[PDB]
Amino acid sequence: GSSRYSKKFKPEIAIRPKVRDQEGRMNYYWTLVEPGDKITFEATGNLVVP
Amino acid sequence: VKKGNSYPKLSKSYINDKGKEVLVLWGIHHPSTSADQQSLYQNADTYVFV
């Protein structure tokens, strides 16, 4: 969450084709934070953190 | 459709080998009511993956 960005990323589980000999998958994201703003990271798993 | 009295888990793949690109077009049906879930399929909860 932030002052303008908000999205809940529900993890998904499935068998993907092997790329770089690894079964899993990972979606990377980015966002901008204005001066004097707040960004929030709340999760219970399946989250890589900056 | 639900064969017999179940719709077991489905998993199958295709390996592109015909020296060029290939479109593979599919769909996801969205039945109107839970009775349509119970008739056209078998399990209420279900997931589609590609």
UniProtKB/TrEMBL annotation, chain B:
Compartments where found: Host apical cell membrane; Virion membrane
Maturation and modification: Palmitoylated. In natural infection, inactive HA is matured into HA1 and HA2 outside the cell by one or more trypsin-like, arginine-specific endoprotease secreted by the bronchial epithelial cells. One identified protease that may be involved in this process is secreted in lungs by club cells.
Domain of life: Viruses
Function according to Swiss-Prot or TrEMBL: Binds to sialic acid-containing receptors on the cell surface, bringing about the attachment of the virus particle to the cell. This attachment induces virion internalization either through clathrin-dependent endocytosis or through clathrin- and caveolin-independent pathway. Plays a major role in the determination of host range restriction and virulence. Class I viral fusion protein. Responsible for penetration of the virus into the cell cytoplasm by mediating the fusion of the membrane of the endocytosed virus particle with the endosomal membrane. Binds to sialic acid-containing receptors on the cell surface, bringing about the attachment of the virus particle to the cell. This attachment induces virion internalization of about two third of the virus particles through clathrin-dependent endocytosis and about one third through a clathrin- and caveolin-independent pathway. Plays a major role in the determination of host range restriction and virulence. Class I viral fusion protein.
Subunit structure: Homotrimer of disulfide-linked HA1-HA2. Interacts with human CACNA1C.
Homology family: Belongs to the influenza viruses hemagglutinin family.
Record's protein name: Hemagglutinin
Record gene name: HA
Shown stretch of the complete protein: 169 to 218 of 566
